[PDB]
Structures are given as C-alpha cells and as structure tokens.
Design a protein around this ligand. Structure first.
Ligand SMILES: Cc1cc2nc3c(=O)[nH]c(=O)nc-3n(C[C@H](O)[C@H](O)[C@H](O)COP(=O)(O)O)c2cc1C
Ligand code: NA
Length: 162
C-alpha cells in the first residue's frame, strides 16, 4: 500500500486546480511533490482556448511541441511510484507532460496519471500516453475533479495493486 512505497507526485498546473489535487494526494499518501515548472510561464492570454493563435492552441495542435521545463530531478530512480498530474488540454495531456516523460528514462517505472478538467474524462489522455510510451509500467489513472478522501486513495492503490 501507500506506506509500502517511496512515492513522488509530479504535476503541471496553471490555474492551481491540479496543484491543489496534487497537494492533497501527497498529504494522504505521504509522497514527495514535484512541480513541473515551464521555463516560460503560461499567461492568461497563452491559455485562451477561444483564440486559435494562443500559445496553448498552437502547441496543442503540434504533436511534436515540447515546452521546456525549468530544473531536473537528481535521483528520480529513488521513487518506486510516480503519479503524474495535469489539466486536460484539448482532450489529452499538455505537451509539457511529454517533455517531462522524455527527460528521464522511465522504461520499467510505475507511473500513475491523474488529471483535472472542465468536464472531459482522463481516458483519452491515458490511451494516448499508453501508445506514446509503451515501455512505462502504466497503472490505471483517475480524473480527480471531485472530493478526494483517504478511502478513495486507498481503494485506488488496491485496484492498481500497489
Ligand atoms: C488550453 C486549455 C485547454 C483545455 N482543454 C480542456 C478539455 O479538452 N476538456 C476539459 O474538460 N477541460 C479543458 N480545459 C480546462 C482545464 O482542464 C481545467 O480548467 C483544469 O482544472 C485546469 O487545471 P489547472 O488549474 O491545474 O491549470 C482546458 C484548459 C486550457 C487552459
Ligand atoms: Na506499458
């Protein structure tokens, strides 16, 4: 279970919703936290999904976009379980999550996705990640827009056999 693991909760958050979820997961599980920080922070304008020319619109229609991240984990291999959280952007993971997954060799490493959203599910995000990084030990993830309890998290660990 959660006590049986060295855990890192890594997350990307622009408006703080996913950050608050990450902090709660960490509090419950006793995990360490890592903020995936962009080298160039996203502004309000950048995040305007109604503007086809906004940074986020342009990045998200480019399958090869890789926003740069500020900083590096020194000993990521010391963590046995990595949770990776993000807002849903255009039905998938933001491409900074691709930058993150490609910054380390996560082959053979247990990764559990989580997300927040304005209504869309995490399933489409997961299927795309599963195909993009087949050598990661992906465990079933969760959309976490609701109430996160210690029972929800302990069941989750049970369901994914951690
Ligand atoms: C560029 C952009 C695209 C988004 N795309 C979706 C989407 O496809 N489906 C959805 O339900 N919400 C979408 N959202 C809403 C975010 O997923 C949601 O507001 C999230 O909780 C924000 O998390 P954050 O505060 O940690 O940045 C989008 C938000 C942005 C800024
Ligand atoms: Na896999």
């Amino acid at each position: 279970g959660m006590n049986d693991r060295k855990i890192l909760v890594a997350y990307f958050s622009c408006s703080g919703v996913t950050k608050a979820v990450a902090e709660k997961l960490a509090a419950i599980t006793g995990a360490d936290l890592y903020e995936i920080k962009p080298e160039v922070p996203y502004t309000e304008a950048d995040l305007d999904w109604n503007d086809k020319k906004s940074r986020s619109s342009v990045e998200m229609r480019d399958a090869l976009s890789r926003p740069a991240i500020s900083g590096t984990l020194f000993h990521p291999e010391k963590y046995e379980v990595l949770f990776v959280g993000f807002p849903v952007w255009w039905y998938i993971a933001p491409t900074i999550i691709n930058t993150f997954l490609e910054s380390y060799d996560f082959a053979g490493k247990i990764v559990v996705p989580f997300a927040t959203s304005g209504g869309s599910g995490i399933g489409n995000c997961e299927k795309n990640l599963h195909k993009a990084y087949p050598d990661i030990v992906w465990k079933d993830g969760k959309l976490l827009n609701g109430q996160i309890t210690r029972d929800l998290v302990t069941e989750w660990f049970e369901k994914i056999r951690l």
